[PDB]
Amino acid sequence: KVFGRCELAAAMKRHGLDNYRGYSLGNWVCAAKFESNFNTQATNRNTDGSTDYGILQINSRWWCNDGRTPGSRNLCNIPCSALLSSDITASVNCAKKIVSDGNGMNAWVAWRNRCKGTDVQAWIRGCRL
Numbered sequence: 001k002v003f004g005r006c007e008l009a010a011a012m013k014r015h016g017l018d019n020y021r022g023y024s025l026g027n028w029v030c031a032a033k034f035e036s037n038f039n040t041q042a043t044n045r046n047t048d049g050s051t052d053y054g055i056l057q058i059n060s061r062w063w064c065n066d067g068r069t070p071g072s073r074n075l076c077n078i079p080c081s082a083l084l085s086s087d088i089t090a091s092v093n094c095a096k097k098i099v100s101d102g103n104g105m106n107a108w109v110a111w112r113n114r115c116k117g118t119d120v121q122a123w124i125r126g127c128r129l
């Protein structure tokens with residue numbers, strides 16, 4: 001599923017990401033934008049052999065099991081395929097676990113390089129939340 005900006009801002013808000021652990025919702029939307037271009041089925045292989053899955057490109061080296069990343073953990077206790085669903089519950093709750101790791105949203109390299117320190121509020125501008 002390819003979410004609309006406001007539509008994802010909405011679903012995220014519901015699933016409780018808005019200001020989750022201090023990050024305004026506009027950050028989560030920004031991260032979604034530049035990680036997956038709002039698509040739930042986005043996958044991208046990393047050279048280390050791991051793969052990033054879903055709206056927030058969750059990585060298999062640590063967070064989900066895809067059965068093809070040797071010596072990786074499955075901390076979110078889920079099959080990486082679950083992060084590819086129209087339903088964003090899995091990606092959310094997992095992102096919650098990730099962003100709590102201690103390093104916050106820097107865990108997302110597109111967030112750090114493309115959202116961090118930018119006017120993120122714009123991503124939720126005009127949306128009926």
Ligand SMILES: [Cl-]
Nearest residue numbers: 067068069070
């Ligand atoms: Cl694996």
Ligand SMILES: [Cl-]
Nearest residue numbers: 022103104105
């Ligand atoms: Cl933080």
Ligand code: NA
Nearest residue numbers: 060064072073
């Ligand atoms: Na894993």
